[PDB]
């Protein structure tokens, strides 16, 4: 029900995620299409070279996660909290 210590590049499609905990996950090269995260926690996750289309984070808490080379803009985050989060190369 919560997931940890993984790396992925495949792109789950048109999905709604609610109440998930991702401890220590790598989101490498993944292309989100119509994905929504709700009430979710990202602990020490990493997003590298991700793209997001019609994709949103709603009431989510990111902790010590890196956003490197993403397209994530502030509008894609809805009442979400960031703790200890770095943002590096934004396109």
Contact 90, 68 (CB under 8 A): no
For residue 80, which of 66, 59, 64 has the smallest C-alpha distance? 59
Is residue 20 within 8 A of residue 3, CB to CB? The reply is yes
Question: Whole-number minimum distance, CB 13 to other proteins, in Å?
Answer: 28
Structure tokens at 65: 């996660």
CB of 15 to other proteins, least distance (A): 26
Q: Is 44 in the site for other proteins (CB under 8 A)?
A: yes
Contacting range for other proteins; rule: CB under 8 A; set: 9-17, 23-31, 51-59, 81-89: 81-89
Residues in contact with other proteins, total (CB under 8 A)? 16
Residue 50 has φ and ψ, to the nearest 5°, of -90, 155
Contact status: 88 vs other proteins (CB under 8 A)? yes
The verdict on 90 binding other proteins (CB under 8 A) reads: yes
Residues in contact with other proteins by CB under 8 A are 44, 46, 64-66, 68, 81-90
């Amino acid at each position: 029900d919560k997931y940890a210590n993984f790396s992925i590049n495949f792109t789950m499609e048109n999905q709604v995620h609610t109440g998930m905990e991702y401890d220590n996950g790598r989101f490498l090269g993944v292309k989100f299409k119509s994905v929504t995260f709700k009430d979710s926690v990202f602990k020490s996750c990493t997003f590298d070279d991700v793209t997001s289309v019609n994709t949103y984070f709603k009431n989510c808490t990111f902790i010590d996660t890196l956003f490197e080379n993403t397209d994530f803009e502030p509008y894609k985050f809805i009442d979400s909290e960031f703790q200890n989060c770095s943002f590096l190369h934004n396109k």
